[PDB]
Amino acid sequence: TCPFYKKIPGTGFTVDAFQYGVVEGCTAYFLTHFHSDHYAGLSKHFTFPVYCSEITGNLLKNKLHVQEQYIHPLPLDTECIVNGVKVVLLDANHCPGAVMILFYLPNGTVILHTGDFRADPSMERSLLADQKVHMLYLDTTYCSPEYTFPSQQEVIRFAINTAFEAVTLNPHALVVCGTYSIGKEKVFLAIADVLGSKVGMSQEKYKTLQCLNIPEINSLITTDMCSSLVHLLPMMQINFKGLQSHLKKCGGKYNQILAFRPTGWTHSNKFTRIADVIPQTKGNISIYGIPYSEHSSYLEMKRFVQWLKPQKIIPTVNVGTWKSRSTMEKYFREWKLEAGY
Numbered sequence: 001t002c003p004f005y006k007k008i009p010g011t012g013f014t015v016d017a018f019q020y021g022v023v024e025g026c027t028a029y030f031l032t033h034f035h036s037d038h039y040a041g042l043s044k045h046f047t048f049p050v051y052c053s054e055i056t057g058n059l060l061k062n063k064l065h066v067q068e069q070y071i072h073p074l075p076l077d078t079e080c081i082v083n084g085v086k087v088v089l090l091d092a093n094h095c096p097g098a099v100m101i102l103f104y105l106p107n108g109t110v111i112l113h114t115g116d117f118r119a120d121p122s123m124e125r126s127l128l129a130d131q132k133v134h135m136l137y138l139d140t141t142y143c144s145p146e147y148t149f150p151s152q153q154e155v156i157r158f159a160i161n162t163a164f165e166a167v168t169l170n171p172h173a174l175v176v177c178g179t180y181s182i183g184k185e186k187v188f189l190a191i192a193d194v195l196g197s198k199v200g201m202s203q204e205k206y207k208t209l210q211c212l213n214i215p216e217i218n219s220l221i222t223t224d225m226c227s228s229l230v231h232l233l234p235m236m237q238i239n240f241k242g243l244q245s246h247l248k249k250c251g252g253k254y255n256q257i258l259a260f261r262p263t264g265w266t267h268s269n270k271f272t273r274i275a276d277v278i279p280q281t282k283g284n285i286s287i288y289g290i291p292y293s294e295h296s297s298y299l300e301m302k303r304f305v306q307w308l309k310p311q312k313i314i315p316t317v318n319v320g321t322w323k324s325r326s327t328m329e330k331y332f333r334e335w336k337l338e339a340g341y
C-alpha cells in the first residue's frame with residue numbers, strides 16, 4: 001500500500017509510486033528521475049499516464065520499454081497544466097533528467113517535492129522565489145551534521161590533475177572509472193577531455209548515455225574500447241582482482257591502471273580535505289576513492305530549507321524507522337527556531 005509521503009493531497013497525483021500495483025484514485029503518476037528505487041515497478045506492462053522530464057522519458061522508452069503512448073514528457077522551468085492542475089518541473093542538480101516538482105493546488109496551497117536533489121544557492125533565484133511554498137517533501141539522505149563533502153568542482157579538479165600527471169608520466173597507462181546507474185558522468189567526461197580521448201564502454205552503458213541529451217555526445221563516447229584511454233566498468237569490478245583481469249583483456253596495449261571509485265560519503269570525510277587524498281596501491285594498479293555527491297550535504301540542505309521557510313516538512317528518505325524520524329524532526333525544529341519561521 002502507497003505511503004502518505006508519495007501522495008499529493010487534493011489531487012489524484014502520486015510521486016515515485018510504481019511498486020504498489022494500481023494506486024486507488026491515482027490519475028497521474030510522476031517520476032522524478034531514472035534511479036531504480038524510484039522507478040521500481042515500471043516495465044512494458046504499465047498502462048497509466050507517467051509524467052516526467054524529456055531525458056527520463058527517453059530512458060523509460062529505450063531501457064525499460066514502457067510504451068510511448070503512456071509517456072508524457074514536460075519541459076523544465078515552464079508552467080504546464082496536468083489534469084487541470086498547474087505544475088512546474090525544476091532541475092534537481094542530481095543525475096541527468098532529475099527534477100523537483102512544484103504543485104499549485106486548487107485551494108491555493110503550494111507544494112514542492114524535491115525528488116532526490118543537491119541543494120544549491122542558484123535554486124533561491126528560480127521560480128521558487130516568486131511565491132510562498134507551504135509544504136516541502138524533502139530528500140533527507142544526509143540530514144545529520146557529520147555529512148560534509150567537497151564541492152563537485154573541487155573533486156573534478158583533483159581527478160583531472162591526477163589523471164593528467166599519471167598518463168604524462170606513463171603514456172601506456174589506462175584510466176578506469178566505476179559506474180552503476182546514471183549520474184556522476186562529469187567524472188569520466190572531464191578526465192577524458194584533459195587526455196584528448198573518447199570514453200569506451202559496454203554496449204548497454206553506451207545505449208544509456210545516448211538517451212541523456214548531452215551536446216556533442218558522439219564525439220565523447222565509443223563502444224570501441226581499443227581506441228580509448230578512459231574506460232567505464234561496473235563499480236563491482238573496481239578492485240585489484242577485477243582491474244588485473246581487465247588489463248589482461250585489453251591485449252597488452254596498457255601496462256598500468258589508474259582507477260577512480262566515485263562514492264557517496266564513507267566514514268573518513270570527517271578528517272581528510274580533497275588535496276590530501278592518497279590511493280590504495282597494489283603493484284601496477286592504483287585506486288582512488290573520491291567523494292563525488294549528487295545529494296545535499298547537511299549544510300546545503302539546512303541553507304535551502306531556512307531560505308524556503310516551509311510550514312510543514314515531509315521527509316522522503318530514512319522514514320522507515322522511529323529513531324530516524326525522531327532525529328530528523330529535532331533538526332527541523334532547530335532550523336525553524338534559528339531562522340524565525
Ligand code: NI
Binds near residue numbers: 094
Ligand atoms: Ni537518486
